[PDB]
Design a protein around this ligand. Structure first.
Ligand SMILES: [Zn+2]
Ligand SMILES: [Zn+2]
Ligand SMILES: [Zn+2]
Ligand SMILES: [Zn+2]
Ligand SMILES: [Zn+2]
Ligand SMILES: [Zn+2]
Lengths: 102, 92
């Protein structure tokens, strides 16, 4: 077993954790440290700040790492563009197309 | 009735109504002739989203891919250890 965080890649750990769904549908192998970051929904915040793909939540402007398998399960792609975080995606965007036309 | 669901357009007047990306409800987005034509050509984000955040380069061909965007969801594959590829690149 090898931690699938590319900045880590360790084969030694006290506890093997599970991460994001890989292209196979299997869950990634992460070491204790990296898997703890993932479980707290702060993996990309701790390891991916130099990468492209960050967007701000449509409602609260929280930074969300898009185009990244490690945040795929915590990011919602919104109907009219943009992204919503775990909190703000319980709601839908009201754009000017909702106007009493119905 | 209809209004273009491309938020920078919002037109209600078009020669022909077309369909875009799937919405959460399962319905397809309404798009005017112009915006729907861009979606059909696989050029929607190039035509409308270049100044938005979220763009990444394909790991193989370096095509610019608009991530975190429902309108390009269909063409972008999230790679196992990070990054993206074109759907047609990533199978390699
Ligand atoms: Zn690790
Ligand atoms: Zn990330
Ligand atoms: Zn939010
Ligand atoms: Zn339009
Ligand atoms: Zn886009
Ligand atoms: Zn490519």
């Amino acid at each position: 077993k090898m931690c699938m965080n590319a900045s880590c890649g360790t084969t030694s750990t006290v506890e093997w954790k599970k991460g994001w769904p890989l292209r196979s549908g299997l869950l990634a192998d992460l070491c204790y440290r990296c898997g703890s970051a993932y479980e707290s929904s702060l993996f990309c915040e701790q390891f991916h700040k130099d990468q492209s793909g960050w967007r701000e939540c449509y409602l609260c402007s929280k930074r969300l790492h898009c185009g990244c398998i490690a945040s795929k399960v915590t990011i919602e792609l919104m109907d009219y563009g943009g992204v919503g975080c775990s909190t703000c995606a319980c709601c839908h965007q009201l754009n000017l197309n909702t106007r009493g036309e119905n």
